[PDB]
Ligand binder design. Structure first.
Ligand code: MET
Ligand SMILES: [Zn+2]
Length: 544
C-alpha cells in the first residue's frame, strides 16, 4: 500500500561497472524485490552520471563527441545490470532534458531564496589548452622529496600532501604547458544556512548510527559554502544568465535521480506521480542506497538543495561499505579488480547475489568476497541445503507418481514451523539485516534436510508396499523447498524462475500458507550446479 521510490548512486560514465558497484545495486535490488513481494508500489530508478571535465577530456582523446561516448557506456552499464537482474523501472542519464530543466529550476529557486553567493577564486589554468585544471590534471615535482611526475595533491613516493600550486615545474596533464594562477567568478551554495535542519535530521534516529557519528564530525569541522560552478570548456549544463559558466557535475548528479523519475512518469503518460513523490507534502517514501564515499554529498548538500527549492527530502539513506576481495582492496595486479561483465563469463548472477546477501547487514562495514569461501558457501548453501530439497525428491515424484504431489502434508507441524518464520525473515529483509535473514533461512533448510534424513527416502524407495510413504515424504520435502525459495526470491531471481517452472506456480509471500497438495510438478534438468576453484582461478586470470 506504500509508495516507495528507491535509487542507488549514479555510476560515472567514464568507467565500467565492477564488483564494488554490484554490491550496491544488488543490495538495493534485494530490498526492492522484497518490497514488491509485500504488495507496495515501488519505483526503482537510476541513471548514469555523465557530466564533467574527465568525461569531456576522455571523449576528446577518443575523437568522438561526449554524447556518443556516454551513450556507449550507458548501454554497457545497463547490459551489466540487466545481466545481474537489477530490476530497474527506469535507467536514465544526468545528461537529459529532464535533468537540465530540473537543475535549472532548483538553481533558480535556490538563487531567489538567497542561497547562492558569488565570489572570485584563483585556480591553476592551462593557457595553451585554454581551460582551468582540476587538481588531478596538474602534475609536477613533489615540493618535499623532489620526486618527478607526481599528480595532484599528493606524492606517491614520500606520501606528502599539498596543494597542486606547490608542485615544482608544474605541467598540464592535458597539454604539457605550464599552468598559471588565474581568477574566475564562481557561484556558491550556502550549505551553512541549513546547518540546524541537518543537525536535527542527524539526531532524529533515522540514519545509521555510524553515519550520524560521521556527520557530527563534519558539523564539528564546520560546514562551508559549496563551489557549484565550473568554467567552459565543460560538458554539462550551462548556468542561466551566466555565459561561460556551468553547473559542477555534483550539483546536477543527484538531481539526475529526480530527472530519471520525471522521465519514467512522462514515458508512462503519468502526469500526477512526479509531484506526489517529490512535493513537500508527499506521503511517499524516498530512499537512496549509497556508498560511504559519497555520504557528504547525499546527506548534507542534497537535503539542503531540496529544502531550499521546496522539494521533499530523503526518508532515509542506506549506506554500505567497500567491497574487498580475499580480504583486501581490489588489486589489478592480483586480478581481483573484477568487472561485472567479466564475472558473468565465469559465474551466474545468483551466486554473487547470494554471497553478498549472506554477508550484508544494516551497518556500513566492508563486505569481503573471499573466493575460496565463495565456492564453499555457494555449494554448501544453494546446492546442498536449499536446492537439495527439490533435487533429492523430484525424481521419485516424477517417475513413480506421475509428477503428482501427495494430497496432504506428511508433517503439518514442521510445515507450520517454516511458515511461522515468515514474520521474522520478512522483518530482516525489511531492516536490511540480510545476513540475519539468510541465517534464518539456512537454519530452516537444515531442519528440512534433517527431516528428509529422518524419513530416509532412499531406504523407503526400495521397500515393498511403501509407495504411499515415499510420495508423502518427497512431497513434504518439495513443500519445504517451496517455502524456502519464497523467502529467497528477492535474492535469487533466476533460480526462483526455474523453481517456479518446476513447481508450476508463481511464488508469493502469502502463498506459502497454502501448501501444494494433489498438485502436478514438472521435471527439470538441474536447478543449480556446483562451482569450483578452477573456475575462480580462471576468473582471476581473466581479470589480470
Ligand atoms: C548522484 S550519485 C553520484 C555518484 C558518483 N557518480 C560516484 O560514482 O561517486
Ligand atoms: Zn614527495
Amino acid at each position: 500500500a506504500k509508495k516507495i521510490l528507491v535509487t542507488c548512486a549514479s555510476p560515472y560514465a567514464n568507467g565500467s561497472i565492477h564488483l564494488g558497484h554490484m554490491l550496491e545495486h544488488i543490495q538495493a535490488d534485494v530490498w526492492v524485490r522484497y518490497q514488491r513481494m509485500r504488495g507496495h508500489e515501488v519505483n526503482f530508478i537510476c541513471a548514469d552520471d555523465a557530466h564533467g571535465t574527465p568525461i569531456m577530456l576522455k571523449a576528446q582523446q577518443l575523437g568522438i563527441t561526449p554524447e556518443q561516448m556516454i551513450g556507449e557506456m550507458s548501454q554497457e552499464h545497463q547490459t551489466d545490470f540487466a545481466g545481474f537482474n537489477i530490476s530497474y523501472d527506469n535507467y536514465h542519464s544526468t545528461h537529459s532534458e529532464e535533468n537540465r530543466q530540473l537543475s535549472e529550476l532548483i538553481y533558480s529557486r535556490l538563487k531567489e531564496n538567497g542561497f547562492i553567493k558569488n565570489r572570485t577564486i584563483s585556480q591553476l589554468y592551462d593557457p595553451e589548452k585554454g581551460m582551468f585544471l582540476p587538481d588531478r590534471f596538474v602534475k609536477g615535482t613533489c615540493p618535499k622529496c623532489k620526486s618527478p611526475d607526481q599528480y595532484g595533491d599528493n606524492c606517491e613516493v614520500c606520501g606528502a600532501t599539498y596543494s597542486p600550486t606547490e608542485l615544482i615545474e608544474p605541467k598540464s596533464v592535458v597539454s604539457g604547458a605550464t599552468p598559471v594562477m588565474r581568477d574566475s567568478e564562481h557561484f556558491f551554495f550556502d550549505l551553512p544556512s541549513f546547518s540546524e535542519m541537518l543537525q536535527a535530521w542527524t539526531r532524529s534516529g533515522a540514519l545509521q548510527e555510524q553515519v550520524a557519528n560521521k556527520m557530527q564530525e563534519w558539523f564539528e569541522s564546520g560546514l562551508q559554502q559549496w563551489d557549484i560552478s565550473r568554467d567552459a570548456p565543460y560538458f554539462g549544463f550551462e548556468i542561466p544568465n551566466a555565459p561561460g559558466k556551468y553547473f559542477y557535475v555534483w550539483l546536477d548528479a543527484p538531481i539526475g535521480l529526480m530527472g530519471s523519475f520525471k522521465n519514467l512518469c512522462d514515458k508512462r503518460g503519468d502526469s500526477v506521480s512526479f509531484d506526489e513523490y517529490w512535493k513537500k507534502d508527499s506521503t511517499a517514501e524516498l530512499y537512496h542506497f549509497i556508498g560511504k564515499d559519497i555520504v557528504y554529498f547525499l546527506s548534507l548538500f542534497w537535503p539542503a538543495m531540496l529544502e531550499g527549492s521546496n522539494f521533499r527530502k530523503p526518508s532515509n539513506l542506506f549506506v554500505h561499505g567497500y567491497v574487498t576481495v580475499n580480504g583486501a582492496k581490489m588489486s589489478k595486479s592480483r586480478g581481483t579488480f573484477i568487472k561485472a561483465s567479466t564475472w558473468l563469463n565465469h559465474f551466474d548472477a545468483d551466486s554473487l547475489r547470494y554471497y553478498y546477501t549472506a554477508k550484508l547487514s544494516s551497518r556500513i562495514d566492508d563486505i569481503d568476497l573471499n573466493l575460496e569461501d565463495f565456492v564453499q558457501r555457494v555449494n554448501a548453501d544453494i546446492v546442498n541445503k536449499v536446492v537439495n530439497l527439490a533435487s533429492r525428491n523430484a525424481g521419485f515424484i516424477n517417475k513413480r507418481f506421475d509428477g503428482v504431489l501427495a494430497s496432504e502434508l506428511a508433517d503439518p507441524q514442521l510445515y507450520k514451523t517454516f511458515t511461522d518464520a515468515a514474520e521474522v525473515i520478512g522483518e530482516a529483509w525489511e531492516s536490511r539485516e540480510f545476513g540475519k535473514a539468510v541465517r534464518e533461512i539456512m537454519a530452516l533448510a537444515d531442519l528440512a534436510n534433517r527431516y528428509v534424513d529422518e524419513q530416509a527416502p532412499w531406504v523407503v524407495a526400495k521397500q515393498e508396499g511403501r509407495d504411499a510413504d515415499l510420495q508423502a515424504i518427497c512431497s513434504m520435502g518439495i513443500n519445504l523447498f517451496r517455502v524456502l525459495m519464497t523467502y529467497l526470491k528477492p535474492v535469487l531471481p533466476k533460480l526462483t524462475e526455474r523453481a517456479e517452472a518446476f513447481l508450476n506456480t508463481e511464488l508469493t509471500w502469502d502463498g506459502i500458507q497454502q501448501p501444494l497438495l494433489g498438485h502436478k510438478v514438472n521435471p527439470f534438468k538441474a536447478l543449480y550446479n556446483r562451482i569450483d576453484m578452477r573456475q575462480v582461478e580462471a576468473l582471476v586470470e581473466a581479470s589480470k
